[PDB]
Tab-separated table of C-alpha atoms in Angstrom:
chain	number	residue	atom	x	y	z
A	1	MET	CA	54.293	81.001	69.744
A	2	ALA	CA	53.838	77.244	71.248
A	3	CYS	CA	51.053	76.149	73.711
A	4	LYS	CA	50.853	72.466	74.767
A	5	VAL	CA	50.749	70.608	77.811
A	6	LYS	CA	48.073	73.782	79.263
A	7	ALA	CA	45.672	72.876	82.233
A	8	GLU	CA	45.971	69.596	80.193
A	9	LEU	CA	45.120	67.840	84.020
A	10	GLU	CA	42.097	70.109	83.783
A	11	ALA	CA	40.087	67.865	81.197
A	12	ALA	CA	41.031	64.421	83.676
A	13	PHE	CA	39.702	66.187	86.787
A	14	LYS	CA	36.435	67.927	85.351
A	15	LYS	CA	35.757	64.682	83.843
A	16	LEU	CA	37.303	62.975	86.455
A	17	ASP	CA	33.889	63.910	88.377
A	18	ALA	CA	33.123	67.818	88.548
A	19	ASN	CA	29.510	66.014	89.339
A	20	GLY	CA	29.700	62.326	89.853
A	21	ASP	CA	26.305	61.598	88.773
A	22	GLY	CA	26.154	57.995	87.506
A	23	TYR	CA	29.867	57.542	85.655
A	24	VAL	CA	33.164	55.604	85.927
A	25	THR	CA	35.792	58.212	86.625
A	26	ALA	CA	38.548	59.002	88.732
A	27	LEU	CA	36.116	58.550	91.846
A	28	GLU	CA	37.911	54.999	91.778
A	29	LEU	CA	41.318	56.896	90.992
A	30	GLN	CA	41.107	58.220	94.157
A	31	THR	CA	41.580	54.761	95.518
A	32	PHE	CA	44.640	54.273	92.571
A	33	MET	CA	46.092	57.354	94.796
A	34	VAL	CA	45.293	55.779	98.440
A	35	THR	CA	46.523	52.123	96.861
A	36	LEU	CA	49.326	53.862	95.003
A	37	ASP	CA	49.033	57.821	95.961
A	38	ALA	CA	52.630	58.054	93.381
A	39	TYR	CA	52.503	54.597	91.948
A	40	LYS	CA	54.863	53.651	94.357
A	41	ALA	CA	53.746	49.680	93.770
A	42	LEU	CA	53.193	50.679	89.606
A	43	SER	CA	51.021	47.936	87.749
A	44	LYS	CA	53.194	44.695	88.868
A	45	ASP	CA	50.127	43.197	89.457
A	46	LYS	CA	47.607	45.368	91.781
A	47	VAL	CA	46.913	48.267	89.383
A	48	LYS	CA	44.682	45.415	87.340
A	49	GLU	CA	43.139	43.322	90.132
A	50	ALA	CA	41.287	47.011	90.865
A	51	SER	CA	41.291	48.378	87.449
A	52	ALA	CA	40.718	45.013	85.726
A	53	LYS	CA	37.342	45.347	87.357
A	54	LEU	CA	36.150	48.961	87.246
A	55	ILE	CA	37.711	48.743	83.322
A	56	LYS	CA	35.098	45.814	82.892
A	57	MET	CA	32.337	47.983	83.832
A	58	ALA	CA	33.459	51.466	82.326
A	59	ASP	CA	36.740	50.586	80.026
A	60	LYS	CA	34.949	48.904	76.728
A	61	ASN	CA	36.972	50.889	74.664
A	62	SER	CA	38.837	53.422	76.244
A	63	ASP	CA	35.763	55.965	76.902
A	64	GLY	CA	35.728	56.216	80.729
A	65	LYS	CA	38.357	58.433	81.163
A	66	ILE	CA	40.784	59.529	78.499
A	67	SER	CA	43.093	63.173	79.002
A	68	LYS	CA	45.278	64.018	81.983
A	69	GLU	CA	43.754	60.783	83.531
A	70	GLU	CA	45.872	58.885	81.106
A	71	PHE	CA	48.493	61.742	82.059
A	72	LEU	CA	48.490	60.761	85.806
A	73	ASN	CA	47.187	57.318	85.412
A	74	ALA	CA	49.650	56.502	82.673
A	75	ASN	CA	52.758	59.050	82.887
A	76	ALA	CA	53.813	56.508	85.915
A	77	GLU	CA	52.545	53.601	84.054
A	78	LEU	CA	54.069	54.666	80.898
A	79	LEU	CA	57.199	55.618	82.205
A	80	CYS	CA	57.481	53.133	84.513
A	81	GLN	CA	61.047	51.351	84.694
A	82	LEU	CA	62.737	50.663	87.656
A	83	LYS	CA	65.716	48.247	87.497
């Protein structure tokens, strides 16, 4: 059968906001996307300047965003290996 990947993105998004009441989400990811719509600048020292703040208020142990978020927010960062 085999069933992986799937709408794994649906988790981060539906959690990225879905309703956005008063919890840290992709709401900043948009900034991520606006500051690096495609991680064109990676996280050499720009992603933390904005994330280090957003993570200190929501990411105490990796609870704010965990799923496709790590996928889309870590896929590039985890894959990043340019020359």
